[PDB]
Design a protein around this ligand. Structure first.
Ligand SMILES: [Mg+2]
Ligand SMILES: [Mg+2]
Ligand SMILES: [Mg+2]
Ligand SMILES: [Mg+2]
Ligand SMILES: [Mg+2]
Ligand SMILES: [Mg+2]
Ligand SMILES: [Mg+2]
Ligand SMILES: [Mg+2]
Ligand SMILES: [Mg+2]
Ligand SMILES: [Mg+2]
Ligand SMILES: [Mg+2]
Ligand SMILES: [Mg+2]
Ligand SMILES: [Mg+2]
Ligand SMILES: [Mg+2]
Ligand SMILES: [Mg+2]
Ligand SMILES: [Mg+2]
Ligand SMILES: [Mg+2]
Ligand SMILES: [Mg+2]
Ligand SMILES: [Mg+2]
Ligand SMILES: [Zn+2]
Lengths: 140, 78, 80, 97, 129, 152
RNA sequence: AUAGCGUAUAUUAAAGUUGUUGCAGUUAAAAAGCUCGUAGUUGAACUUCUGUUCAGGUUCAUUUCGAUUCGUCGUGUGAAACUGGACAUACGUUUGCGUAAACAUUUUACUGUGAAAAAAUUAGAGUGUUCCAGGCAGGUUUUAGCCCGAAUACAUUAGCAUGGAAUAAUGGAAUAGGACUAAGUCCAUUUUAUUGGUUCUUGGAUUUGGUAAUGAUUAAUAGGGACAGUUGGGGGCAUUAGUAUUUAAUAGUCAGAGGUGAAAUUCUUGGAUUUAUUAAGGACUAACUAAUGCGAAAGCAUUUGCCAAAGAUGUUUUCAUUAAUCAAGAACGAAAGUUAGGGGAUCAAAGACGAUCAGAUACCGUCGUAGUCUUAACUAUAAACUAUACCGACUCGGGAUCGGCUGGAAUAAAUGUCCAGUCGGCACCGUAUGAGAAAUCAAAGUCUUUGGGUUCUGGGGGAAG
């Protein structure tokens, strides 16, 4: 039985069948139709943007805190994006309307941990790093 | 007019699934009036200079034979 | 103790005709003597429809389901 | 049609042998005398039956035939058969009188 | 619908070896089935076997001892160039140390080994170990 | 097994040919006499099969080919009495027509409509065979109206 | 980890979570409601089996030996699978010197060689770029030189050449001048330095004698067909019954009937409920009625008659691979619903009311329309359920059951009993040293010891049918 042809003239039906069923695999689907290119980064690794808002975001259950964040206007897209601002009092290194460098959170299009729905993090402020600034290597 | 079409059936091999696939090709051939050609006969044709848009082949030898049903469905790999 | 190659007769006789080694049939042929005109005829064991003796036209056998009914005083022997 | 069964016992059993012709195999398992399967370390139900040899005076000789049977065979209830036949081929059954 | 008589006879065989059975009635049979058996017998696995002529296809009784761990057919009967031998002996067989992959060749039906010694190949039939 | 009954169709009706190919010892008819009887029966408009039955029940002839060497139809062919349309197809069409007949009148009968579909299906399916094997004229088709006038 | 090391994103292994090898689909996502069927994929068995002898190697074994040596060689003897001769009704003629050709061998797939083939890459030999990445160089005082290298493999598909026995497909002589051979008749015809007649050859066609074993494999526990006694709640027409609900008539009798947890809406003196006898009108087939039957599924239960159809069994009947599964394309397909007519008794969505309740636009009660039934038509859907695809094998035991058949036995001698076989159905009960995550499963078994044939479906959850 096995519901699958075994025969030596069966070649195309086999391969076509796969060329079909392959679509149910998600990464294949998302890859094959442009999905990457339409996302707020336009397929890219990071993006530069402007800061519209500094915003607090109350954490998912069962955690309570205020996640410091920013809403950024991506310069390539002009799409609006909600991004997280890492470590401690780094929300202070940000002024409204700065240039800011933004990357994924490591789930490739999805939110991490207790921050609901927020898919991006802040990397650079003006030109400098949040790391450089935090450890106080450079000054803004 | 003085032209037929010929059909060559072959098995193309798909490496992965490790079996073959049934493909065919249609070659327009030129028939000299000196031949009696029944639909569904066996033709030998030599290469030729470009006679027309489609035709690069000319009929050399006809072999008579009987095909049952339509000529299309009949599959001979020789 | 059992050997497929030398199966036991009384067993094969019990088996269905297709499940024996030689796949042998159950039918016979019989010489039948008409009760009236005393003619001898040949009749298949499971014979279909009806048989009338050629001499006197009287009824010898009746059809069924694999049995033939030998009618009345008609005597028979199996041919083999 | 016995031939293969006889030829099977014709030569002795050997564990792994390297090119230096050592025996490498830690122990040589007993194999069942009917099915010819291997007798496990772990086999709960594998059995070795010893049966006595008899002189014309009814005397035991102290001589024994050992018939090994394996778990699957007893368990399927083939044992009572297997044994009898194993005793035929060794010439010990039926018992003469 | 019967396809591949070699497959019928081979599976029925393995089944009866596995059930500890002492012999197998095998039906129906072909050249190929008999050459395959002549091969397994020659190679030590089955014992003596007898062919029975019913006027049609045939029947075959096979004395088994027990040796066969498995004996299969591969369908479809693939194409096995000499290059591909490695694949098939690694994929099909229990170990390098034994077991055979039988093939049809224009030189006849062979242990894959007989094929290296005959230097040919190309059509896979089955295997036994 | 039984064609076009999926699920349970599967069983074995009998016939099993004996081993002895030689005709039986008690049988005294010359193969010629047999060919005579079979042709008489034939000209009377019987079927190769029906002829077979007659020879077997009445005449003590178990298998005609093991006597003659020629099967019944081949005999009919040589000796010229021939059943133009194969007995085989003949009956299938007779049937498909009896169903046509009954169905024109009872138009609400669904089972018989479906049975018809099945039988016609088999008819075409046999046509292909007898055509590729040259036993039927190449342009021959089964239609309602064509086959109704077709010797059935 | 380390002169590097975090992070983001695409992609690779992890992934047997894309599965040809190699996955899953009873309940985790998953078998299409059901049949027919074209493309596609898939296809039962049979043909120079075999034996005898010779040689060449190649392997093997070793109570044959040897020689030398740190293991090869020689040799035994037998034993193998070859390879190739040879004779056997037996892998071909015929000619020119082990090799060509021509003739003849139906074609191919497949396989072994070979040709044709781009370097750099990659694999890899040689070589101490101080190692190494790597480079293609190098090594030597015998120097107005010398020594040595710049390998080789791989180079998939398709073309090309050639060896092939199996396997697989296809072929050939069934209206046969088919084959061989002899004798004729035509149409061509190179050579005979040239044209003309005769001829010759040759190569096509054709007529007739003769020769030959003249030419048709079995007959699948494959399939189609015939036929014979049956079996069925399969279908379509007609017929026909039966109480029951509702209503009416004709008789009776009276004060209450209904309904509920209580009740109230209702019905009732114009006489209800109730009783007897009829009649009308639509439905519906109780009980027998079952782990029973039939039908493709949906579904099918009163009598009789008609019409076509069906399985299983029985065949020493006939055909002879006609078959399996199936995108296209088709026939069906509960209920509810829709269109146009009928019909309208029962129930009864909507609705009207009673009650209950905090609220009931609900469960309960009294009513009641569409519907329920029917002609013609649409519609295509269900937990359309064994949630379990179809054809085919093979793997345990036991009674029983429905339908055939085969013997046997008892009687009150038969369309009835019982007994023993067996073929096919629906199941059940044990049991598996078989399967599974388990529940469980005689298939859901014969699965990492992974390949009998074929369609379909699934790839975290929602979004969302
Ligand atoms: Mg994935
Ligand atoms: Mg990461
Ligand atoms: Mg959480
Ligand atoms: Mg630090
Ligand atoms: Mg069957
Ligand atoms: Mg569920
Ligand atoms: Mg075959
Ligand atoms: Mg010869
Ligand atoms: Mg009435
Ligand atoms: Mg009525
Ligand atoms: Mg019943
Ligand atoms: Mg209406
Ligand atoms: Mg109240
Ligand atoms: Mg009511
Ligand atoms: Mg009886
Ligand atoms: Mg599983
Ligand atoms: Mg277990
Ligand atoms: Mg059970
Ligand atoms: Mg599998
Ligand atoms: Zn008489």
């Amino acid at each position: 039985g096995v519901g699958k042809p075994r025969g030596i003239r069966a070649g195309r039906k086999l391969a076509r069948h796969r060329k079909d069923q392959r679509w149910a695999d998600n990464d294949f689907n998302k890859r094959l139709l442009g999905s990457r290119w339409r996302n707020p980064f336009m397929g890219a690794s990071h993006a530069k943007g402007l800061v519209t808002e500094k915003i607090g975001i109350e954490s998912k259950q069962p955690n309570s805190a205020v996640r410091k964040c920013v809403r950024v206007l991506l310069r390539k897209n002009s799409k609006k994006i909600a991004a997280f601002v890492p470590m401690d009092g780094c929300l202070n290194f940000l002024a409204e309307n700065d240039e800011v460098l933004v990357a994924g959170l490591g789930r490739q299009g999805h939110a991490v941990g207790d921050i609901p729905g927020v898919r991006f993090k802040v990397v650079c402020v003006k030109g400098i790093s949040l790391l450089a600034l935090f450890k106080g290597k450079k000054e803004k | 007019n003085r032209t037929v079409i010929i059909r060559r059936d072959y098995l193309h091999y798909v490496r992965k699934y490790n079996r073959y696939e049934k493909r065919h090709r249609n070659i327009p051939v030129h028939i000299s009036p000196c031949f009696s050609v029944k639909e569904g006969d066996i033709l030998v044709a030599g290469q030729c200079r470009p006679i027309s848009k489609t035709v690069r082949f000319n009929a050399l030898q006809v072999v008579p034979n009987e095909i049952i049903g339509s000529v299309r469905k009949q599959f001979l790999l020789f | 103790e059992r050997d497929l190659l030398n199966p036991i007769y009384e067993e094969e006789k019990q088996k269905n005709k297709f499940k024996r080694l030689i796949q042998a049939p159950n039918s016979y042929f019989m010489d039948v003597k008409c009760a009236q005109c005393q003619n001898i005829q040949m009749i298949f064991s499971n014979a279909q429809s009806t048989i009338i003796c050629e001499k006197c036209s009287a009824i010898l056998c009746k059809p069924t389901g694999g049995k033939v009914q030998i009618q009345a005083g008609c005597a028979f022997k199996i041919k083999n | 049609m016995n031939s293969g069964r006889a030829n099977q016992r014709s030569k002795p059993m050997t564990g792994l042998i390297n090119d230096k012709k050592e025996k490498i195999d830690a122990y040589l398992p007993r194999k069942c005398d009917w099915s010819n399967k291997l007798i496990f370390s772990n086999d709960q139900s594998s059995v070795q039956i010893a049966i006595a040899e008899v002189g014309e005076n009814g005397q035991a000789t102290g001589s024994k035939t050992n018939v090994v049977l394996c778990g699957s065979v007893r368990s399927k209830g083939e044992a009572h058969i297997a044994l009898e036949n194993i005793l035929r081929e060794r010439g010990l059954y039926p018992i003469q009188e | 619908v019967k396809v591949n008589i070699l497959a019928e006879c081979l599976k029925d065989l393995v089944n009866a070896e596995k059930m500890g059975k002492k012999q197998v009635l095998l039906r129906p049979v072909s050249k190929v089935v008999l050459k395959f058996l002549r091969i397994m017998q020659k190679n030590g696995y089955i014992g003596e076997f007898e062919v029975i002529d019913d006027h049609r296809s045939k029947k075959v009784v096979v004395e088994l001892i027990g040796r066969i761990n498995k004996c299969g057919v591969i369908s479809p009967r693939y194409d096995v160039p000499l290059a591909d031998f490695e694949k098939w002996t690694n994929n099909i067989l229990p170990s390098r140390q034994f077991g055979n992959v039988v093939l049809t060749t224009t030189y006849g039906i062979l242990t894959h080994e007989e094929c290296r010694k005959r230097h040919t190949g190309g059509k896979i039939l089955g295997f036994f170990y | 097994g039984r064609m076009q009954m999926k699920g349970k169709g599967k069983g074995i009706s009998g016939s099993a040919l004996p081993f002895k190919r030689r005709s039986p010892k008690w049988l005294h008819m010359t193969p010629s006499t047999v060919v005579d009887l079979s042709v008489k029966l034939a000209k009377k408009g019987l079927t190769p099969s029906q002829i077979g039955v007659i020879l077997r029940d009445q005449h003590g002839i178990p298998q005609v080919r093991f006597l003659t060497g020629q099967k019944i139809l081949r005999i009919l062919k040589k000796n010229g009495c021939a059943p133009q349309l194969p007995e085989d197809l003949y009956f299938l069409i007779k049937k498909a027509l009896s169903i046509r007949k009954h169905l024109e009148k009872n138009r609400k009968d669904k089972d018989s409509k479906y049975r018809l579909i099945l039988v016609e299906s088999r008819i075409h399916r046999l046509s292909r065979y007898y055509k590729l094997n040259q036993k039927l004229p190449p342009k021959w088709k089964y239609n309602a109206q064509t086959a109704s006038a077709l010797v059935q």
